[PDB]
């Protein structure tokens, strides 16, 4: 009936070098699967 | 030359929408590092 403030919600901490791993992993799956979508 | 007519929709959302998910999450960490 009445609002409050959360004692929760830790934020996220995706690193600079961990961006590079995730960006590369999508791009090898891009160059793998794009032939099969054609 | 024949083509599946829809892979260029498929393999442009397969590459972007997880990478801009990943590109969202790196910027926030930089702001947190700054302490702003």
């Amino acid at each position: 009936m009445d609002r409050s403030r959360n004692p929760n919600k830790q934020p996220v901490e995706l690193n600079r070098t961990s961006l590079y791993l995730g960006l590369l992993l999508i791009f090898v799956l891009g160059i793998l699967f794009s032939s099969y979508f054609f | 030359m024949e083509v599946n007519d829809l892979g260029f929709v498929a393999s442009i959302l397969f590459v972007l929408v997880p990478s801009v998910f990943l590109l969202i999450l790196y910027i926030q960490t930089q702001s947190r590092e700054g302490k702003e």
Binding site: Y20, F27, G30, S34, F38 | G7, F8
Partner: peptide, 30 residues
């Protein structure tokens, strides 16, 4: 059409191959 769809995702993978070499963060010892 399809021929630029391979060359796009190829050279976008190759761009991160340049960026992770140069703009790797410096590791600091403690």
């Amino acid at each position: 059409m399809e021929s630029v769809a391979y060359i796009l995702v190829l050279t976008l993978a190759l761009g991160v191959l340049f960026f992770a070499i140069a703009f790797r963060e410096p590791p600091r010892i403690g």
